[PDB]
A paper describes a structure:
NsP1 is the membrane anchor for the complex, forming dodecameric pores that associate monotopically with the membrane in the necks of the spherules to gate their entrance. NsP1 possesses both N′7 methyltransferase and guanylyltransferase activity and reverses the order of these reactions. Each nsP1 protomer is built around a methyltransferase fold common to SAM-dependent methyltransferases with additional insertions (membrane binding and oligomerisation (MBO) loops 1 and 2) and extensions (ring aperture membrane binding oligomerisation (RAMBO) domain) that contribute to pore formation, oligomerization, and membrane binding.
In order to investigate the structure of the pores after the capping/decapping reaction, we analyzed by cryo-EM the structure of nsP1 pores incubated with a cap0 11-nucleotide-long CHIKV RNA. Electron density for the m7GMP base was found in the GTP binding site in both classes. The nsP1 protomers appear tilted outward 8° with respect to the equatorial axis of the ring. The pore opening results on an increase of the inner aperture of 3 Å (from 70 to 73 Å) and the outer diameter of 12 Å (from 178 Å to 190 Å) and a change in the surface charge distribution concomitant with a projection of the active site toward the top of the ring. This conformation resembles the structure of nsP1 pores when expressed in mammalian cells (Discussion) (13), and was not observed in datasets of m7GMP–nsP1 produced following incubation of the substrates and uncapped RNA. Thus, we can conclude that the decapping reaction induces a motion in the ring resulting in an opening of the pore aperture. Here, we show how the postdecapping state induces motions that trigger an opening in the pore, similar to the open form of nsP1 complexes expressed in mammalian cells.
Numbering used by the authors:
A (entry chain C), B (entry chain B), C (entry chain A): 3 to 221, 230 to 364, 376 to 412, 423 to 448, 458 to 469
């Protein structure tokens, strides 16, 4: 029996049910209609992690949202480095929320939280059990299992290492699937969590879901993905790094070799329409040979196609990715058996949609990806070379369609070897 | 449970429900049928702001309409600079309304309001809690959260700065969406709040929704948008400034650096068919790096196309924008998959309309924008360049269609560094 | 609850309901079937004005029809200059009506009216509260709010100024919409109040609704509108002046600068099928900058097309205007999307009519206006110039169609700086 914050008529409830077999999920929607999907996925991941941990084990909360942790009765040590502009806001409401609970209930250890916050305010560098002002690298509190949450800005090996040296044997990471960044897409969408993202070099493109072009009258030759990308989660902007996103795409077995050596395993437990819940087990010593392979089981179709656009009025081509639902791929099997036009594929996609199962601003590019993939497949079956010999004249590859129940294999690296302001601190009190 | 002033058969009630999930909105219409949409949106925004503020916190009302504030029991400090010709009219009824309530009820602090008004009349420069005669820049009363309302004539950074120096940590801004002015449109419409607007250089055009041409017999070369634009809200005229409209389109994080330094965040909370409710948090100090990006989540389609018209009998071309409803875009997905004529697109739009969901005087231009966008998309997919290289021969870009659930991203600036007349004063008493 | 003098099967009852949302209007017809529309509109305007004024405020009645004012219990000061041939007739019945009420009821201040009339008869230049014999310019009685009624022969700025100097702060003006004269139409119709009008230069035309040609056997080169125009309201004739009709089309804000300076705002409150109820607020001093713009919100379609006729047997071309109903424009949206012949447009208009919604003698010209507008729109969409540049070869403009919910903007001027005969006087007694 699990309760979600989505109306029962939404397809994402079915998606969550599929992605969380161990839980019976039923709708409960009151307030939200935009960020309900991400909130529900995060809540279900938190519940699954809680059910699969020792109730008497101290757990870090690197993905610190202390306002959220008000009902969790487990030993939570939130870590709020105070790095962004928003962190104080959260802090503020958290304090207010504590005050709101300071005289209502006595079951969630309100006095402990308030005292810990007061101690932190008196001295920022306190190591109180349920709060701190240090980065996960610089944190000092010792726990057993550490859980991350929407952390796409920290090198995964380094944070995991500095958590292991603090006795962290298990870690979880709820976030966005990192497949689009291992495939090096310029732009992409997660059109069920209301998120788009684009490389800063395509922000002035016309058709992608995160751009703003100019109505011009018309008139460096190397466009490649750069480290800086932008994530529009609904109306919120997040500047993220490609290299620190292609860092939580950890191989199945990887070694952290330094002063303390460890062998660790990452296994993606939950996967839903773009979100993933990775689990990394950390243990000292070397426990085998690292294959250096990261495996992504595509529970639903993953398309990545090279679309042509116009950036700053200049015609260019770049790659955009999306996560098609599994049912769409299943029902498009037969059509994709034939060479299908982008227009006809778009019409069939609209018909299959119907409410909708896939957002319509993606259909125009999903259809083009399907058509390019079908044409490439036919051109493949229309020419056959000699078996056993790699006969090189490298040719075009303008689509990557990972249908449901397929797997992606990437060779990755497997061997790795105090800001709070005085006025703000005064105000928070 | 929320009550609106619109008949239950109007689509705008559904639009409001979509734009205000946190409230259960039900129709209640007696008097209005023209300005019901804007009034309902403003009332819902006011209710949402009230529910999300400290009940014991003094709040400014820069968008001063003191006649309205007769039921708000919160600490309201209306600011009436007395700058426009209509300001006295409001004042008059305000006073009358106070007199109307001077001997009816004793729950809304009528005596306080009357005494404050008398003190203001005795001396204009009084700093009474619930009234003043100073501009927001020149106001002296100190509060916690400041609310704006239909303020499209004051530089947002300067007003926010002068409110922060007065201890304003939070501010709200209910108004018209500023996307059409970030895209630099010559003319545009908000065809659900009965508003049109045009640049003074196109006021003598033929087909736009705010113009008046002449039946002539026929017979500088640079037309670009200028600062002065005109808003026809129903039958009321408002001369606004482009630069002071492209000033409340604030980035997500912006710094106000002066004698007191602040870092602030603007996040659009509510968005309905053209109206927006922005929220800016003001705080001293610098709390990160400003990315200099403003993000607009297009909950409903936004079209901006270059139409050809005749101004003063001379053929010209200029850009006009509109906000198509989401359902129209959804149902036009498939058709836009194909090259569709403006005539056939217009016929399909009329059929989709049916009462109506979109006003028909816009359909003739919505269809042309749709057709131009479809043709540009096809011409894009009909030519493909080399990936990875910016091969510049800048070409035509004659449409900007931001479908529902897409995002616009504009690089904006993120680092910023006594009139009352004696006869009127005598009469008001 | 409001009661009108029109049968419930008439479309004008629906038009009135639309134009008067604040009132619940129900039919009550006994006597009239021709002038019911104008009488109902005037009565509703009078009721709305009464409900929105101080009950204890003296009000002028420049549009003096004292016979009508027998039930109005408010302080009415009718002004009858005695300028036309009809004024005595009215006077006569007025006196008779007073006598008819002289011994029936004692609630409407009949004795006061009779005494005032007797005092006026004894001395014409009396300033009695409820009667006078002076023009609004020459009137001496002092009031607060002045109401006009069907006054299309007096310069609006001068009358308003001479009323302000007499302490007139508010004024109303119920009359015919002045849009056809700001667009400078030669002839026009109000085919819901049974009114036509023509310029004296087209009174001998064939097809317009106010003309009389001659069955001739056949055989100055500048036809432009002149000041003198003729209004046929049903069977009654009214010689009006263009310049004094293009004088109550007041801008939104205008300044009356003389011995006493004032800033004033005119806002059209009610608008129905051609009639309007303008409201002008007059106040001393200067309260802003006058933009010099008059805004007309076209709640229903306004057509003005150049038709070719024969005047005195000579072929000429001149412009005629009309007010199409909103529903006709709505249902013609799709057809106007296509190039439509005047004949086929006429057939569709007849089918849409059906009783009728628009009088059929106008359909022949409404259809031609629609067809010319559609052809001009297509020729516009069939040629596109360079954006941003006014490329002048002034070309044809043979139609002006202001669809419902559009706005007309005209640059107007915003800065302005004893006949009774002895025999008649003896007879009236
Ligand atoms: C904290 N957070 C929640 N959703 C997020 N999405 C991205 N791309 N980066 C973030 O830091 C983030
Ligand atoms: C005060 N107000 C209400 N709607 C408004 N619309 C514009 N454009 N400018 C304004 O000042 C305004
Ligand atoms: C007094 N009156 C009633 N309907 C009227 N119509 C016109 N054109 N001129 C008038 O003076 C008039
Ligand atoms: Zn710690
Ligand atoms: Zn103040
Ligand atoms: Zn008088």
């Amino acid at each position: 029996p699990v309760y979600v914050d989505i109306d029962a008529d939404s397809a994402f409830l079915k998606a969550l049910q599929r992605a969380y077999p161990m839980f019976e999920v039923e709708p409960r929607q009151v307030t939200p209609n935009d960020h309900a999907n991400a909130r529900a996925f995060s809540h279900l991941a938190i519940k699954l992690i809680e059910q699969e941990i020792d109730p008497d084990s101290t757990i870090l909360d690197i993905g610190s949202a202390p306002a959220r942790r008000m009902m969790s009765d487990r030993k939570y040590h939130c870590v709020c480095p105070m790095r962004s502009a928003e962190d104080p806001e959260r802090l503020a409401n958290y304090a207010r929320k504590l005050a709101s609970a300071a005289g209502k209930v006595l079951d969630r250890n309100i006095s402990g939280k308030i005292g810990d916050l007061q101690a932190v305010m008196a001295v920022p560098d306190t190591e109180t059990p349920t709060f701190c002002l240090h980065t996960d690298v610089s944190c000092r509190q010792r726990a057993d299992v550490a859980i991350y949450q929407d952390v796409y800005a920290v090198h995964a090996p380094t944070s995991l290492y500095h958590q292991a040296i603090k006795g962290v044997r298990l870690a979880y990471w709820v976030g966005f699937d990192t497949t689009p960044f291992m495939y090096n897409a310029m732009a992409g969408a997660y059109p069920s969590y209301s998120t788009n993202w684009a490389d800063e070099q395509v922000l002035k493109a016309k058709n992608i879901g995160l751009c703003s072009t100019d109505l011009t009258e018309g008139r460096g030759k190397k466009l490649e993905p750069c480290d800086r990308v932008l994530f529009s989660v609904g109306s919120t902007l997040y500047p993220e790094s490609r290299k620190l996103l292609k860092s939580w795409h950890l191989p199945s077995v990887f070694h952290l070799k330094g002063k303390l050596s460890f062998t660790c395993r990452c296994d993606t437990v939950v996967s839903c329409e773009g979100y993933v819940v990775k689990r990394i087990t950390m243990s000292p010593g070397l426990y085998g040979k690292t294959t250096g392979y990261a495996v992504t089981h595509h529970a639903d179709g993953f398309l990545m196609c090279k679309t042509t656009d116009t950036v700053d009025g200049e015609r260019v081509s770049f790659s955009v990715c999306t996560y098609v639902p599994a049912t769409i791929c299943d029902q498009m099997t037969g059509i994709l058996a034939t060479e299908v036009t982008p227009e006809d594929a778009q019409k069939l996609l609209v018909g299959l949609n119907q409410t909708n199962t896939m957002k319509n601003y993606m259909i125009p590019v999903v259809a083009q990806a399907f058509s390019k993939w079908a044409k490439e497949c036919r051109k493949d079956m229309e020419d056959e070379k000699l078996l056993g010999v790699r006969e090189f004249k490298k040719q075009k590859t303008h689509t990557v369609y990972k249908r449901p129940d397929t797997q992606s294999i990437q060779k990755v690296q497997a061997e790795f070897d105090s800001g709070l302001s005085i006025p703000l601190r005064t105000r928070i009190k």
